[PDB]
Design a protein around this ligand. Structure first.
Ligand SMILES: *[C@@H]1O[C@H](CO)[C@@H](O)[C@H](O)[C@H]1NC(C)=O
Ligand SMILES: *[C@@H]1O[C@H](CO)[C@@H](O)[C@H](O)[C@H]1NC(C)=O
Ligand SMILES: *[C@@H]1O[C@H](CO)[C@@H](O)[C@H](O)[C@H]1NC(C)=O
Ligand SMILES: *[C@@H]1O[C@H](CO)[C@@H](O)[C@H](O)[C@H]1NC(C)=O
Ligand SMILES: *[C@@H]1O[C@H](CO)[C@@H](O)[C@H](O)[C@H]1NC(C)=O
Ligand SMILES: *[C@@H]1O[C@H](CO)[C@@H](O)[C@H](O)[C@H]1NC(C)=O
Ligand SMILES: *[C@@H]1O[C@H](CO)[C@@H](O)[C@H](O)[C@H]1NC(C)=O
Ligand SMILES: *[C@@H]1O[C@H](CO)[C@@H](O)[C@H](O)[C@H]1NC(C)=O
Ligand SMILES: *[C@@H]1O[C@H](CO)[C@@H](O)[C@H](O)[C@H]1NC(C)=O
Ligand SMILES: *[C@@H]1O[C@H](CO)[C@@H](O)[C@H](O)[C@H]1NC(C)=O
Ligand SMILES: *[C@@H]1O[C@H](CO)[C@@H](O)[C@H](O)[C@H]1NC(C)=O
Ligand SMILES: *[C@@H]1O[C@H](CO)[C@@H](O)[C@H](O)[C@H]1NC(C)=O
Lengths: 123, 106, 120, 120, 120, 123, 106, 123, 106
């Protein structure tokens, strides 16, 4: 039904910069808020960032507020995440997902409705 | 993070419960405690959302509830293909949007 | 000074007399028509300030950047060496462009505010 | 689109053109009477928004819960399948009830604000 | 109560009916002149509230201290033993003084707000 | 002159819920703000909560912000305090009192004008 | 909390002072430092409010003052019935409404 | 061009009060924001306080928010700093300086344009 | 505070660089990293403001730049009279207006 496919880089050294992107199809892209969630190779899941459906509002976990930028382009059906500094604790598989927020005139979400395959970020 | 048991197990056909315990500011205050099923090497699939709601495509063997600051997922009729890492996720307000628990190995 | 006393003063100094000119905007058929038009004009200006989100202010800051093409003077020349009459003449051709952008900015802000209020 | 172009659109889409209709509200005896009435109507609507605490907004959120009896439709039907004309018809009988509650809410908020400001 | 029902009540109690009197301010040549004057009066009062920074409130607190000379009564006498008609009579001579100070306070606040917004 | 009489429960276990109430007479109830103050059996006094005269505004100490709810009903002349969780450090005599706040048009209080007898809360 | 001496004593008929020392954000900044007299087993009675004000019904032997960040209660003419735990209470702003000191055993 | 001359006291004991002032000439006093910067006898520089050109806005470092008051009088061309408590860590040479802020209609400063000679404050 | 090397030196006529390293919230985010030259016993003189700007009256031997969260002052053509304690100062927002580094002894 819904295909979310992440693209990204490989090995980056601490203090560098890495950009991820997520392509999506099978639903109206502009109708859903989207987020990034990461899983360290041996640990569980944690939320990283959230962007609204319009793209004007962004939210981050404190640990990435000064390092990560989340953006989207609704004409290209593309979600992007630009990361700077990338310390050793940032090694993880980064998944893009649909859901997590709703724009007042839509019913509540507060869940991650669709998940991608995940890009592997190694520091 | 939310606290979950390291593992839950049982025989095929039996019902088991995977609990998730949080605090007053997250599971307690908000009725938004979803559950995900992550098979090893694969992305998580959504199993439960809100507190008791189930996405279309998920069978009736997966259910859940909330009492106080404790939420739980009940898996009845255990099947061979249900082995996965289960996670809970709670909405925790405007400053801390989501809190995930540790994974539970079924 | 009194009404329009700052007309020949610099843009900075004249910004300190905004209440003087503001008070003097409100202060048989032909006269009724003139008074009705004065009221309609005043209300259109107040509506326009409301649309931009400046309904209660005489000095109101916004989120529209200066485009440079409109005027490439630095702040020192504009606020210390020019009067408001000269400034009004200098950017007359771009007034509607600026107004359009101001309206667009507020519409986005209102939607964003509503979406922030929707978060539990 | 232009003035009233969104009249047949859904409630969600038409909420994005509020400034278009708002601008067109202001845009011998019989004509003076018509113009005076147009001004009085406009001012009554602005006063009513002021009473509710919405004096500077086109989209304004409040503290009055929806009572369900007024309309038991979910948000998806109201915002995606209905127009504003249909909504206006559907809840016409409850308009004054809603307005009364809105006024009461703001009065309590004003008193509470004053009491918070009084704390040293 | 209804319109002006609180006129004989204490200042505190009558402060709870401000929306009742506010609604009743808006509610051939001689009649058009009377209506135009009513509109101009209303707009002058709204402009004056705007100048003071009270454009959207019925109860508005400010940064001008009470000067004592205007009235040396304590709050208990003013709010529990006096009506608004008596208060209006008691300080009529100082109304313009108070209004002048209110305008000055808002002008300083607007400049200060702008300067705070300028900090990166 | 003014009679403030607290009513409440006895022994509650940690993790439970306990409600206290205070009846008052001899003054106009709706004209005064009210508060709750507690004294541990062997310690001094500390402020717990404050409610306005109208009941619309409530204030708490940080230690009870997520546990205690303060409310009043001016037609019944009743002040109520609903407590949840009730950890061992919450054992105390809980007094209701008149004063502590004033609604802008009244003179300042910032003192506790009248005190009740006190309910004993044992965890 | 505010600092008070553990105990103050004197002979009948003598004057004693019970001090209360706070910080700039509470006793210093605000002129709202009340005093209460709590007989053992009984609820506290109000003795002083604001800084120097005394409630009706309280005799002229109880007075007080404030200097810097230190407030004090002076009890002149000590009587046999004045044995009580005395407390000071300061207003400390919008986030921390009231701060009480430790009790002083007369 | 610009002369900034500080005046002040000598030895003060902890818990006391000391006032400094700075006279200035050679420029329009009312056109510039001003600040105080201190240097401990054996250490480097740190910012202490900032006042706007109009005098309505003041800013302080957290360590002096409850101790120092900054004010100016544009008719007397005088900048003043009133300090209370003055703990041992406050011993320093206190310099007055021109710059550090700009009132929206002026170009940015964010630097200290002119410096005085410095008053020595010993606790 | 900002980190600077304790000392920098070189022969007359040579070029040296005095670095200043901060964090993302100060040197990184804002292009306001000024430099001052303080001769011992004297008040500091302004040498650099913004990032690359130089006050009138300062010769062309003093320059600077910013990259990432690191700013630097380059002093070419070292003279005998250039011995001073050099300081960097960064604008760090509304809560923390200015941050100074440790002094560098040339
Ligand atoms: C007119 O110009 C002179 C010279 O620049 C100036 O001093 C004067 O203040 C100006 N008038 C007003 C009203 O500003
Ligand atoms: C300035 O306006 C012109 C149109 O006159 C536009 O092409 C240009 O992109 C604008 N500048 C910016 C930075 O957007
Ligand atoms: C403003 O522009 C003029 C003309 O180029 C220039 O002479 C003047 O120095 C500029 N002022 C500032 C502050 O940049
Ligand atoms: C505005 O347009 C007129 C032509 O109608 C032209 O002469 C004038 O220079 C223009 N002004 C600006 C600032 O572009
Ligand atoms: C009219 O209805 C059609 C079909 O639903 C829709 O595609 C179209 O956008 C509507 N017109 C407007 C102005 O929204
Ligand atoms: C809804 O309105 C009816 C009156 O029409 C009222 O009786 C009912 O209590 C309202 N619902 C709520 C939840 O207050
Ligand atoms: C809204 O109500 C209709 C009618 O019961 C139902 O078919 C539809 O699924 C509802 N939508 C939501 C989002 O609840
Ligand atoms: C409003 O009242 C009329 C009767 O005057 C009735 O026919 C109509 O159905 C009512 N509408 C609602 C929504 O109650
Ligand atoms: C008129 O005065 C009486 C006596 O003070 C009072 O009880 C009554 O409420 C007053 N009327 C109004 C409308 O307040
Ligand atoms: C009160 O007003 C008088 C003028 O009538 C003035 O002289 C006096 O200074 C004012 N009081 C204060 C505290 O400013
Ligand atoms: C108000 O003033 C009157 C007259 O001096 C006095 O009798 C009354 O007690 C005062 N009330 C208060 C609360 O100060
Ligand atoms: C106001 O002025 C009149 C004289 O015109 C005087 O009789 C009256 O007492 C004055 N009122 C006050 C409150 O000063």
């Amino acid at each position: 039904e819904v295909q979310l496919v992440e693209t990204g880089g490989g090995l980056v050294q601490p203090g560098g910069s890495l950009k991820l992107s997520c392509r999506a199809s099978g639903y109206t892209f502009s109708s859903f808020a989207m987020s990034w969630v990461r899983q360290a190779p041996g640990k569980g899941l944690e939320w990283v960032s959230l962007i609204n459906d319009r793209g004007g509002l962004t939210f981050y976990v404190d640990s990435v507020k000064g390092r990560f930028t989340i953006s989207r382009d609704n004409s290209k059906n593309t979600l992007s995440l630009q990361m700077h500094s990338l310390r050793d604790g940032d090694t993880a598989v980064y998944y893009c997902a649909t859901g997590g927020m709703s724009s007042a005139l839509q019913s509540s979400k507060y869940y991650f409705d669709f998940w991608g395959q995940g890009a592997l970020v190694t520091v | 993070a939310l606290t979950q048991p390291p593992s839950v197990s049982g025989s095929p056909g039996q019902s088991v419960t995977i609990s998730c315990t949080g605090t007053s500011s997250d599971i307690g205050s908000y009725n938004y405690v979803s559950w995900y099923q992550q098979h090893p090497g694969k992305a998580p699939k959504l199993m439960i959302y809100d507190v008791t709601q189930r996405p279309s495509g998920v069978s009736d063997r997966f259910s859940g509830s909330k009492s106080g600051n404790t939420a739980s997922l009940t898996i009845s009729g255990l099947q061979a293909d249900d082995e996965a890492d289960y996670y809970c996720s709670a909405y925790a307000g405007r400053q801390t949007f989501y809190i995930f628990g540790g994974g539970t190995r079924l | 000074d009194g009404f329009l006393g700052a007309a020949g003063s610099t843009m900075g100094a004249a910004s300190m007399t905004l209440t003087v000119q503001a008070r003097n905007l409100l202060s048989g058929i032909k006269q009724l028509q003139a008074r009705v038009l004065a009221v309609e004009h005043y209300l259109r200006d107040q509506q326009l300030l409301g649309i931009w989100g400046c309904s209660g202010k005489l000095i109101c800051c916004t989120n529209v950047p200066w485009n440079s093409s409109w005027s490439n003077r630095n702040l020192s020349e504009i606020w210390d060496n020019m009067t408001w009459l000269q400034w009004d003449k200098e950017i007359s051709n771009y007034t509607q462009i600026i107004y359009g952008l101001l309206e667009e900015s507020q519409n986005q802000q209102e939607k964003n505010e509503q979406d922030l209020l929707a978060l539990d």
